[PDB]
Amino acid sequence: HHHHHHMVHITLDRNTANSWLIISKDRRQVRMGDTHQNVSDNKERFSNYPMVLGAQRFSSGKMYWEVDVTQKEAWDLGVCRDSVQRKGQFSLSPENGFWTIWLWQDSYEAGTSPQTTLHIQVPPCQIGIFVDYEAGVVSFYNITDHGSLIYTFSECVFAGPLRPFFNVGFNYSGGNAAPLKLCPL
Ligand SMILES: CCC(=O)Nc1nc(C)cs1
């Protein structure tokens, strides 16, 4: 792909984070803590899952960023509407305002309803995410495999401003403590 020139500097929004997440000083890394991180509750925080939003809101144009997923066993990445549900249980689907892929139990899937199997020969250490607001496109790229395409959501109905979306995943196994990191431009 040749989307690199639409690169945007994403930072994480502390106020949206699940209360167990630890966001770095530079707001570019997030990991699961082993306990509640001693923050007050608010209506923005994802309550049920280890999720956080980027601070940036996008309503037009083309945007590209990269995320490091090295040594994680489970995670979700993509974009979502600014008005997604924060409290209780929900599925990741375009009907609910999410355009995402994930790793779970040694398989990669796109968050369609129902979910779609992805075909990845080279397990990615870094994922590229491309959004074309006007075209209604969200695409995912395998940076470890020379930028190969992972998945394209097309005919997207965003229906609002978009925010970068992250889930570091639970760490029941002791094998998923590693952070998600926003990679430099
Ligand atoms: C990826 C295409 C898409 O956005 N489909 C949607 N389904 C509904 C029903 C809302 S958005």
Swiss-Prot record:
<comment type="function">
    <text>E3 ubiquitin-protein ligase whose activity is dependent on E2 enzymes, UBE2D1, UBE2D2, UBE2E1 and UBE2E2. Forms a ubiquitin ligase complex in cooperation with the E2 UBE2D2 that is used not only for the ubiquitination of USP4 and IKBKB but also for its self-ubiquitination. Component of cullin-RING-based SCF (SKP1-CUL1-F-box protein) E3 ubiquitin-protein ligase complexes such as SCF(SKP2)-like complexes. A TRIM21-containing SCF(SKP2)-like complex is shown to mediate ubiquitination of CDKN1B ('Thr-187' phosphorylated-form), thereby promoting its degradation by the proteasome.</text>
</comment>
<comment type="similarity">
    <text>Belongs to the TRIM/RBCC family.</text>
</comment>
<comment type="subunit">
    <text>Homotrimer. Component of a SCF(SKP2)-like complex containing CUL1, SKP1, TRIM21 and SKP2. Interacts with CALR, CUL1, FBXW11, HSPA5, IKBKB, IRF3, SKP1 and VCP. Interacts with SKP2; the interaction with SKP2 does not depend on an intact F-box domain. Interacts (via N-terminus and C-terminus) with DCP2 (via N-terminus and C-terminus). Interacts (via C-terminus) with IRF8 (via C-terminus). Interacts with ULK1, BECN1 and with ATG8 family members, including GABARAP, GABARAPL1, GABARAPL2 and MAP1LC3C/LC3C. Interacts with TRIM21 and SQSTM1/sequestosome 1. Interacts with IRF3.</text>
</comment>
<protein>
    <recommendedName>
        <fullName>E3 ubiquitin-protein ligase TRIM21</fullName>
    </recommendedName>
</protein>
<feature type="domain" description="B30.2/SPRY">
    <location>
        <begin position="8"/>
        <end position="185"/>
    </location>
</feature>
